[PDB]
Design a binder for this molecule. Structure first.
Ligand SMILES: CC(C)CCC[C@@H](C)[C@H]1CC[C@H]2[C@@H]3CC=C4C[C@@H](O)CC[C@]4(C)[C@H]3CC[C@]12C
Ligand SMILES: CC(C)CCC[C@@H](C)[C@H]1CC[C@H]2[C@@H]3CC=C4C[C@@H](O)CC[C@]4(C)[C@H]3CC[C@]12C
Lengths: 397, 397
């Protein structure tokens, strides 16, 4: 993939004053959120505003988290790099490389499935991190395993081709790359001129605001709907009204966390690292088809999945139909998302998996844009509703 | 005022696909509304979907309404026109016109305050129209009295100047004008080429959809929040949570009824009447100042108010400061809106009046755009909350 230096689409679309007043509408809704919250706290407690309880809960064992992420960063920075450095020369010199290459590949596969497959899982399941603090490092586990597989899969064909012709990376560029936003070792060879401290300052400020806005969304919209509403009727009417009323919190979480994470989080970590030289999403809100919607949401994970998984999984399978391969990579993406949600939530019941399959096989056989939006609203509503329902159901009993 | 033939701003802004997908997002939310409504009705009644109860309630005495509007149309079409026709020639010929002009002006003032000031009020308060059916014809009363005053105030200076120089309208152009969307007798002298039947068809279809969308908004968002939630705590927490949770129904009603009424209602009655040769709103969502917001929302009523009331009420008062005149015309607009809401709701407690004065005198002494949006959200929330609270409180006891 070619990395052309165009910015994020929202960063150039947000200067139009209608979208600018959409943004101001959101932050004025945030002002009303904090005002209602402070007023309710001041009328309930009488005084002592600004408690920040649930962020002290969900970010509890933060020293453990930073130590785990530090040893994880050191592991993913040293062990794959040193393993590949040790493998390259021996592959060049040894008499039989067909066995040694398989042996070091087995070493790397027992690392990325042993170290990055148990360590971030064992720390979580043993030291029992709170859900957000376990989610952050299982997301770091996913990011690290994907990035290490990308590193090795871009370096092994390079060494093999240069040895059939008869190119090891440097420590500095890998050290920088595992901090870069992208997920392909092609890397940030196109870079930016200067770190604009005010620009990254306002981007991190927007990250701050969007995170606290998610906090208040869970405080005012997902606390009344989902905290111990258990005068159990087991009614399908109550369930359909939950999946209806939890569309606004669901779709606000969707909009604002897409914005927050992609746009401002990794644009801050783009212009702080001088690699804002790629787009991270096209307009997914404008998709004539659902297959057209797949290619243009979270295009980093899509780039990784499509390129590596799809290309290798069809070139090695040699299937007659590529639609089967597309469904296979969508199934592996569904199981990856389900595993992430299962380890950060500690839950079965993958409504994401069966809902994904249903909305995929139901669209297979501008009115379709309206159907995409109603499917997206109903699916986001049912996803947030059922996952929050399970989470507050085990927290109930 | 000059009427230049530019279209509505939203009709040319809605072709951008981000705003187009905002529109499709709204109509997909409408699809989800009708789906949830039909599913709830089918799980509650077992069968027999598509009842349309509250539209049979609020549009109850529709034959009475159409007869009242027919006699109102005939009155406003004949009596002011014939009165002015009888006055013009006698003003031209009589020896003393200073007494006869005052006499016929008294006739017109006892018509527009006697006929259009009691008839639409007496029919409502005697035959007891349902709230929507009384609202439609008190809005027609306001529209007719404003339009008749505009007609007479554009014709009396014309006749006076032509008689000091020593121009009666035609029946056809007045007959057409009291159907036109605008509220100034300057009229639709600039007109449109052709009635596009498909265009007015889709505009009336959008009127249909927006009205039923308002219906469902009251069915799913203003029915749970406001129908007999009377386990009275009299709590300020419950009141602040009502004024918070009733922002989404309030602001959706605001957006969609602005859209519906102005844009599609009077654009259908523009292109059906071949006078779509004026704008009816600029971007009010983009207002650096609140005084800047006053000039650009519902610019028809603003044109009437500002031009006639402001100009005449300052030229006859000869005040030293025009800010006092602006506050006076804002006070008369506030009392007009309060009277409209009081006759269509049958209620005192003008939270609109005191809230208008508070938000006016609190802004008098892009962050201000955020303050405008938070003020607009909180004010729309408190307005809908308190008016619906009173309406369902007298319906309670
Ligand atoms: C059939 C029914 C449901 C369709 C209703 C469409 C209405 C609600 C949509 C269509 C066009 C939309 C407007 C288009 C432009 C803007 C400017 C933007 O800066 C703020 C939102 C705002 C003001 C939109 C508000 C909602 C809107 C009026
Ligand atoms: C500090 C926090 C509260 C600011 C949050 C801003 C977020 C929620 C705003 C700012 C920019 C906005 C996006 C800008 C562009 C579009 C395209 C439009 O067709 C649909 C809405 C959508 C997708 C907006 C969704 C909401 C959005 C992402």
């Amino acid at each position: 993939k070619i990395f052309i230096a165009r910015r994020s689409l929202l960063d150039e679309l947000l200067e139009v004053d209608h979208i600018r007043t959409i943004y101001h509408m959101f932050i004025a809704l945030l002002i009303l959120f904090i005002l209602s919250t402070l007023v309710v706290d001041y009328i309930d407690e009488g005084r002592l505003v600004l408690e920040f309880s649930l962020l002290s809960y969900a970010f509890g064992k933060f020293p453990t988290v930073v130590w785990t992420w530090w040893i994880m960063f050191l592991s993913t920075f040293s062990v794959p790099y040193f393993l590949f450095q040790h493998w390259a020369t021996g592959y060049s010199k040894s008499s039989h490389p067909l066995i040694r290459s398989l042996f070091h590949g087995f070493l790397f596969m027992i690392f990325q499935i042993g170290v990055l497959g148990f360590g971030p899982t064992y720390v979580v399941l043993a030291y029992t991190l709170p859900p957000a603090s376990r989610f952050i490092i299982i997301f770091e586990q996913i990011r690290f395993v994907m990035k290490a597989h990308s590193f090795v899969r871009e370096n092994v064909p390079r060494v093999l081709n240069s040895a059939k012709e008869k190119p090891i990376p440097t420590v500095n560029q890998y050290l920088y790359f595992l901090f870069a936003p992208t997920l392909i070792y092609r890397d940030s060879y196109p870079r930016n001129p200067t770190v604009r401290w005010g620009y990254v300052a306002m981007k991190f400020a927007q990250v701050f605001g969007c995170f606290f806005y998610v906090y208040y969304i869970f405080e005012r919209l997902c606390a009344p709907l989902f905290r111990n509403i258990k005068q159990e009727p087991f009614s399908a009417r109550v369930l359909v009204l939950c999946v209806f009323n939890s569309i606004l919190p669901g779709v606000l979480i969707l909009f604002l966390t897409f914005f927050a994470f992609l746009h401002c989080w990794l644009n801050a970590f783009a212009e702080m690292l001088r690699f804002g030289d790629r787009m991270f999403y096209k307009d997914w809100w404008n998709s004539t088809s659902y297959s057209n919607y797949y290619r243009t949401w979270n295009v980093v994970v899509h780039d990784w999945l499509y390129y590596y998984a799809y290309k290798d999984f069809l070139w090695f399978f040699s299937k007659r139909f590529k639609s089967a391969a597309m469904l296979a990579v969508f199934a592996v993406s569904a199981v990856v998302h389900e595993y992430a949600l299962a380890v950060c939530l500690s839950f079965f019941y993958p409504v994401l998996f069966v809902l994904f399959m249903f909305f995929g096989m139901a669209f297979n056989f501008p009115i379709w844009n309206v159907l995409m939006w109603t499917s997206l609203f109903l699916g986001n509503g049912v996803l947030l509703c059922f996952y929050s329902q399970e989470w507050y159901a085990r927290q109930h009993c």
